[PDB]
Structure 1
């Protein structure tokens, strides 16, 4: 009976039915809330297409993949059992069109993977194909029986506005079970990051109990409280310093004004725009944490719901405002203009964030007018999707549901490919929702239930935060529960196996790490533990979390290692469970405790967004954003990139443990890995592109100044950065004399390959700059939701500079070409300084 819930709790990693840490019924309301959305998508989804989850795209096939074709000819090696016949096919052939061509019912599965080439889309539009064309590989499929939908079967089942009183809250006091100066409470009525009204208590002495018994009357009227308003209660000591915070929605999920006695356990601060500050969750640590005691009282329920001509100077002023970037602050004058010309502004979708930031949300008549304005949103509805613009409306500056819902409206038009690109940060954006049940929450729910791949990643992203965010685990747990109740028994069993496996592996990771105080004569224990796991405890096979097409099989005990590191990560290799796998390659997974890999997920995901941006300008910069999933507290997994070594090690081989750093070694290493000259210059060009990619991407992100035992290269020239969570003079990025000699330059010269590198960099850079807004917002979101450390205005404003906002294109070329030159001017000075730093 309720054994199903026990399953779901183990899958979720948090007890959703628990009510030990609630002061209302919002979470439970949201479970019931999501039942319909879950049922509606579960009932409406095509069961066969959900069983095979064809991964496809409507983006045009890029130039770089077109130029790799032999005139409407892609070869597809089909497999029965023994041999395999090849078939010339047009890029535009549907998989049906190929099946009747081969027959000269069944379906084509990719060899070694849970991936199918099925559906009414041309074969150029399946990702697996575009992947094979990119890396220069042959397309191997198998004539297979379709999977039964049965396997996916789902186990079935007084007006606030008539109230002119000033709002007020009684502060009874604070109590802390264990703590020498004074302390006061600051009560804020918030909407977004905007403080509407503020009041303080008198300072009393900071004893383990402090009582005030004071009515704080606010300047705002009850009628003027907008939905999603937050009573943010804060505690300072003293000169002042913030010690604790908690929040409480003043208008609840049923539109009722919040009333009665509350005892709210509070969050502490580390020794600032952090998403965690926004949460409505209270601290679950009742025993240790500070708490505050309040009383709301007056049942009051909130009701549900000009010409456009102007002077020339004002039109220009307003257009100038509408044009500035998302982090340019609006002045009082700017806001007043936007709002007066409300309806002119409404015609420009790009005005929307700014205009909805010009709304006085603490004034009921103005919010009414704002809603009348959202009634007139034809142009918004008609505009082509700008994700950049849409993401801004979903960030911390917008707490109003109707405003936010129009963002989620635009997201509905995203094809499944693009939801995958933005899914991590859409899931992170749930952190900005005032309520647990939101348009965004349901959007993620339904897109996830509509598609096994979004669903798969949705699970791990949500679970990532449920395992290590007390601030948001409750909300996300509710959402994930909603998902698991509609994903199908097949996936429930998949997910179950994966969690079982990663818990086994993380334990071994944690235990091996305990047995070392940097080397290892006890790689004995590791191999011993892995043998014990593989004997009746680890399953025959499991889906690889960061690449769900791949199923892993038996471990390769002999190939598994621990690193001569401080954090002793594991290096695990598995046999692919799929007998149809044509490769011999193992599946390689690193397990690391010690870094916050949520930071790594975000940077790696932004790198993908960059790649996708580049694809729109027909540029490929061969970035290698390897798989990475954060699975728990300072713990996670990383996709092992095969045939790859660090730059440091290439230097340690032809020099030693010293900074002697020869300019020549990398090219030497490359030359000795390339078998032919055909592949060497291919390697070298692959490296010019890689290097350019990572110089630009890392510069824009402000993570370009790196230790070179944290930059790797494949044996085919593909450079890539690693260890992003690891983050006296500096440098823009890493373009060292070793890299420059592969490009055929030295000290103060130029070359064919180097001139290209600049040519590629400048294109790439200016390319990202065409999506300035999108990047600025993802960067702000990234910091706010994933780096508690780095969330001051100054931190967030780094990317304005790096993307040379306001500058013309030609001037931006001159900026970056200078950045490049700063590296030429520094050579090994920083690298060397890193050696002296990171080795003494």
Structure 2
């Protein structure tokens, strides 16, 4: 390759945080084949993208303006303040005007044609043919009662986006030779055997074991394990799952490779251990640590290529049984009797898209004759292709329960029709979904590829999402690094530049973030000594190695300029994270405000990303129902290991320490303090009324959203409010109360203990409207939740843990019983009062 082609690839590694040209931990060519395989899709999308539109990345939507946002326009007239930067002239606009119509009517109303609008202070353009009402930045202003300011400047040069050119009927069997391990320290010497499973989609097809023996650094068996399943009956994407019990270690080997060739030869596999189910147990990856990790030596010998090739109406009562089956929630288990009905009737089942996950779970994947039929069945997809895209339904086909490439591919087919507004909504969960893919190159992996390359805002978050995992998952980091590399070769030198800047800042500051944790420990107090250094270090960073500006990873519209070293401070949290503030690099930025970002170590910010994302989902669901719950899913991006950044919400304080308004160094509580905090924080009386109004919506929001996610019981310390009346939860790492509805909250709604008011009626009433809107999405919520547990939490009950949300969403009831159920929850919160809050700190010491 060229000498530069290598200076290039090292650049790629520093951005990735992993070296994908490194072949030390692979027993095959799957990953390199996948690098090569992705070259076409990469090149295809770069080739098909309009350079101009790709350069300006307009953020748009096809959805109708919600009703709550139409009213906020009581004229059919929108006002745009256009600033050429000396005199700015406002304009009265129709909701249907394209950018071009206003750029046209802006030169008319001034009593060469290639000038564009910009959102003052952000890298957001209003451009392309879309009605201004369909632009996100605009809907964002209307929701917040905010003026639309646009400075007029020149379109960005697409040259900057330039991309560098490129360059048998036998029963299956496996011999288990034995297991070598460098050291075994534990306490009680025990017996150790090996459990071999044939797996397809978390379904175990066949299982065998070895004779247990004394546990030693090396154990030899030299045993052939003969399975029942015949070689031809092995489905593509079938795993050999090898586990050691006494369950200590596990490792996986794909039985059919990326060429559809059956696996043969000798294998020494380095395994994963366990801490005293979960998506990591699925990985075709081997433990990179060859020094400290159990290994297994096995043998495969068998024959070549197994490949893939190309009237009765139900009595009513059976059709009624079938229909009862399809209706059940995603978590509801299928009997043998259930599956046989679903199967025998496959042709009927095909007319019901909501039945596909159950129907495909009714397949014997261990039988080539049956799989073949399944494909014949898939061949006539008419009903599936024409159906309305159901995201929750599509998402079910991408989980750990489906290992078939054709099954998963149809789900991806249906995603193809998602426009960027919605891909952004689901990007994080789809990327996590990559983990359930049997092979590194996948239809889904390629769709994330195209979508990121086609759009910079998608590309931006794709990048960070992938880098999050690559840094923190030895399990999935190899496959992700290949996908990230694929992306980076297509995104343009412009973004390639941004990422590097972003990356430099993040390392530099993650460095500081840890060094400050190490010196100081939990008083929890902040040494004047610690503080002076925190300034010492940061100041050197500002001068010595500064990337003069950078994109804010959770808000890529915004470029942070230089730090304000004076407003920076260590946090008194328990982990001692940094509280940082930057100047905005955009001088045309309208406000004088800095950009606060909190850098922290010791939380898994990955669970927090996932949680914040589901919140952004509940919002979009309500938007479709014309609801606004005034949530505040602040930006949070995971980066390291127990490390990442978080967006500072301006003017927010903790509800706790609003309690501390009068005293604060013990506990207890007092009603009306909060409403007192509000009058005090409102400039006018009209703004105080608005604050009480906002707090009612935002409180109703976190009440419903939190209850469903089963995170509803939180310390006052984790709840925050703005000086503007907006309430929001934080720190989502991980008797009871359904949620937090306290007398201090209630007091602000105008009631103190049992009684009722005009605002308090407004609250209950919203929750119920909000609550029932979610229930319409239960399956969507259930799948998202379950996937979040598998990919995002530690080892879970992929039975019990998932269920909370089933009971929570009142699956199976009618909207009537439900409305009551939730209202009772409010009563339950009125009955605890301060009892729940009061208990934290009891065990503190």
- Aligning the two structures, in what range does the TM-score lie when normalised by the shorter sequence? over 0.9
Distance in structure 2 (CA, Å) of the matches to 1:677 and 1:514: 48
Q: After superposition, what is the alpha-carbon deviation per residue over 1:529-562, rounded to whole angstroms, capped at 9, x for unaligned?
A: 0100001311110000000000000101111011
Single out whichever of 672-681 and 11-20 deviates more from structure 2: 672-681
Distance in structure 1 (CA, Å) of the matches to 2:357 and 2:76: 45
SS in 2 for 1:219: strand
Q: After superposition, what is the alpha-carbon deviation per residue over 1:447-481, rounded to whole angstroms, capped at 9, x for unaligned?
A: 00000000000000000000010000000000000
Q: Is the 8 A contact 1:257 1:302 kept in 2?
A: no
Distance in structure 1 (CA, Å) of the matches to 2:297 and 2:795: 30
Alpha-carbon shift at residue 207 of structure 1 (Å):
0.5
Distance in structure 1 (CA, Å) of the matches to 2:569 and 2:770: 38
SS in 2 for 1:557: coil
Closer, same or farther: CA 212–382 of 1 in aligned 2, 3 Å: same
Distance in structure 1 (CA, Å) of the matches to 2:216 and 2:628: 62
Q: Is the 8 A contact 1:185 1:235 kept in 2?
A: yes
Distance in structure 2 (CA, Å) of the matches to 1:708 and 1:232: 46
* Superposition pairs of residues 451-600 of structure 1, within 5 angstroms: 451-517=455-521, 520-600=528-608
Closer, same or farther: CA 15–302 of 1 in aligned 2, 3 Å: farther
Alpha-carbon shift at residue 657 of structure 1 (Å):
1.6
Which of 756, 764, 767 is the equivalent residue of 1:758? 764
Closer, same or farther: CA 790–654 of 1 in aligned 2, 3 Å: farther
Alpha-carbon shift at residue 658 of structure 1 (Å):
2.4
Q: Is the 8 A contact 2:124 2:557 kept in 1?
A: yes
TM-score if structure 2 supplies the norm length?
0.97
Q: After superposition, what is the alpha-carbon deviation per residue over 1:489-534, rounded to whole angstroms, capped at 9, x for unaligned?
A: 1110110110001000100101111120265542000011010000
Distance in structure 2 (CA, Å) of the matches to 1:617 and 1:38: 37
Which residue in the other structure is 1:399 paired with? Answer: 403
Q: After superposition, what is the alpha-carbon deviation per residue over 1:155-213, rounded to whole angstroms, capped at 9, x for unaligned?
A: 012xxxx9110000000001110101101100000001100000011101110111111
Which of 815, 826, 833 is the equivalent residue of 2:832? 826
Q: After superposition, what is the alpha-carbon deviation per residue over 1:360-397, rounded to whole angstroms, capped at 9, x for unaligned?
A: 10011000000000001101000010000000000000
Single out whichever of 518-527 and 531-540 deviates more from structure 2: 518-527
Q: After superposition, what is the alpha-carbon deviation per residue over 1:211-269, rounded to whole angstroms, capped at 9, x for unaligned?
A: 111111001000100000000100001xxxx1011101000000000111000000011
Q: Is the 8 A contact 2:80 2:91 kept in 1?
A: yes
SS in 2 for 1:216: strand
Q: Is the 8 A contact 2:239 2:255 kept in 1?
A: yes
Distance in structure 2 (CA, Å) of the matches to 1:37 and 1:301: 23
Distance in structure 2 (CA, Å) of the matches to 1:270 and 1:807: 39
Distance in structure 1 (CA, Å) of the matches to 2:843 and 2:215: 43
Alpha-carbon shift at residue 443 of structure 1 (Å):
0.1
Q: Is the 8 A contact 1:460 1:629 kept in 2?
A: yes
Q: After superposition, what is the alpha-carbon deviation per residue over 1:669-721, rounded to whole angstroms, capped at 9, x for unaligned?
A: 01111111211111111111111110111110000000111100001111000
Distance in structure 2 (CA, Å) of the matches to 1:380 and 1:454: 27
SS in 2 for 1:460: helix
Distance in structure 2 (CA, Å) of the matches to 1:520 and 1:210: 58
Which residue in the other structure is 2:288 paired with? Answer: 284
Q: Is the 8 A contact 1:176 1:208 kept in 2?
A: yes
SS in 1 for 2:140: helix
2:178 maps to 1:178 = no
Q: After superposition, what is the alpha-carbon deviation per residue over 1:55-84, rounded to whole angstroms, capped at 9, x for unaligned?
A: 000111001110101311111000112110
Alpha-carbon shift at residue 570 of structure 1 (Å):
0.3
2:692 maps to 1:684 = yes
Alpha-carbon shift at residue 791 of structure 1 (Å):
4.0
Closer, same or farther: CA 606–224 of 1 in aligned 2, 3 Å: same
Alpha-carbon shift at residue 660 of structure 1 (Å):
2.6
Q: Is the 8 A contact 1:308 1:344 kept in 2?
A: no
Alpha-carbon shift at residue 40 of structure 1 (Å):
0.2
Closer, same or farther: CA 789–667 of 1 in aligned 2, 3 Å: farther
Q: After superposition, what is the alpha-carbon deviation per residue over 1:795-822, rounded to whole angstroms, capped at 9, x for unaligned?
A: 0111110001111110111111111111
Distance in structure 1 (CA, Å) of the matches to 2:618 and 2:748: 25
Distance in structure 2 (CA, Å) of the matches to 1:789 and 1:663: 41
Q: Is the 8 A contact 2:80 2:148 kept in 1?
A: yes
Distance in structure 2 (CA, Å) of the matches to 1:176 and 1:644: 53
Q: After superposition, what is the alpha-carbon deviation per residue over 1:84-120, rounded to whole angstroms, capped at 9, x for unaligned?
A: 0001111110000000010111111110111100000
Which residue in the other structure is 1:770 paired with? Answer: 776
Alpha-carbon shift at residue 605 of structure 1 (Å):
0.1
Single out whichever of 438-447 and 61-70 deviates more from structure 2: 61-70
2:650 maps to 1:645 = no
Q: Is the 8 A contact 1:784 1:791 kept in 2?
A: no
Q: Is the 8 A contact 2:118 2:150 kept in 1?
A: yes
SS in 1 for 2:658: helix
Distance in structure 2 (CA, Å) of the matches to 1:746 and 1:493: 56
2:85 maps to 1:111 = no
Alpha-carbon shift at residue 838 of structure 1 (Å):
4.6
Alpha-carbon shift at residue 41 of structure 1 (Å):
0.2
Closer, same or farther: CA 608–407 of 1 in aligned 2, 3 Å: same
Single out whichever of 470-479 and 69-78 deviates more from structure 2: 69-78
State the superposition RMSD in angstroms.
1.8
Closer, same or farther: CA 535–743 of 1 in aligned 2, 3 Å: same
Distance in structure 2 (CA, Å) of the matches to 1:181 and 1:78: 77
SS in 1 for 2:196: strand
Q: Is the 8 A contact 1:345 1:352 kept in 2?
A: yes
Alpha-carbon shift at residue 659 of structure 1 (Å):
2.2
Alpha-carbon shift at residue 302 of structure 1 (Å):
9.2
Q: After superposition, what is the alpha-carbon deviation per residue over 1:581-626, rounded to whole angstroms, capped at 9, x for unaligned?
A: 0111101100010000000000000000000000011010000000
2:27 maps to 1:23 = yes
Alpha-carbon shift at residue 792 of structure 1 (Å):
3.9
Distance in structure 2 (CA, Å) of the matches to 1:805 and 1:773: 10
Q: Is the 8 A contact 1:662 1:738 kept in 2?
A: yes
SS in 1 for 2:660: helix
Distance in structure 1 (CA, Å) of the matches to 2:795 and 2:844: 21
SS in 1 for 2:175: strand
Closer, same or farther: CA 39–560 of 1 in aligned 2, 3 Å: same
2:639 maps to 1:631 = yes
Alpha-carbon shift at residue 301 of structure 1 (Å):
9.3
Distance in structure 2 (CA, Å) of the matches to 1:33 and 1:41: 14
- Aligned residues between the structures: 825
Q: Is the 8 A contact 1:655 1:661 kept in 2?
A: no
Alpha-carbon shift at residue 837 of structure 1 (Å):
3.5
2:210 maps to 1:208 = no
Distance in structure 2 (CA, Å) of the matches to 1:155 and 1:791: 47
Q: Is the 8 A contact 2:790 2:798 kept in 1?
A: no
Alpha-carbon shift at residue 731 of structure 1 (Å):
1.0
Q: Is the 8 A contact 2:268 2:295 kept in 1?
A: yes
Distance in structure 1 (CA, Å) of the matches to 2:20 and 2:545: 28
Q: Is the 8 A contact 1:447 1:454 kept in 2?
A: yes
Q: Is the 8 A contact 1:257 1:301 kept in 2?
A: no
Single out whichever of 479-488 and 745-754 deviates more from structure 2: 745-754
Alpha-carbon shift at residue 308 of structure 1 (Å):
4.3
Single out whichever of 96-105 and 653-662 deviates more from structure 2: 653-662
Distance in structure 2 (CA, Å) of the matches to 1:348 and 1:560: 57
Distance in structure 2 (CA, Å) of the matches to 1:308 and 1:431: 40
Q: After superposition, what is the alpha-carbon deviation per residue over 1:769-805, rounded to whole angstroms, capped at 9, x for unaligned?
A: 0000000000000010000144441001111100011
Distance in structure 1 (CA, Å) of the matches to 2:803 and 2:152: 54
SS in 1 for 2:177: strand
Q: Is the 8 A contact 1:427 1:462 kept in 2?
A: yes
Give ranges in structure 1 of 5+ residues lacking alignment.
none
Closer, same or farther: CA 719–301 of 1 in aligned 2, 3 Å: closer
Q: Is the 8 A contact 1:257 1:300 kept in 2?
A: no
Distance in structure 2 (CA, Å) of the matches to 1:291 and 1:818: 55
Alpha-carbon shift at residue 576 of structure 1 (Å):
0.2
SS in 1 for 2:400: coil
Which residue in the other structure is 2:251 paired with? Answer: 246
SS in 2 for 1:788: coil
Distance in structure 1 (CA, Å) of the matches to 2:806 and 2:477: 32
Q: Is the 8 A contact 2:552 2:558 kept in 1?
A: yes
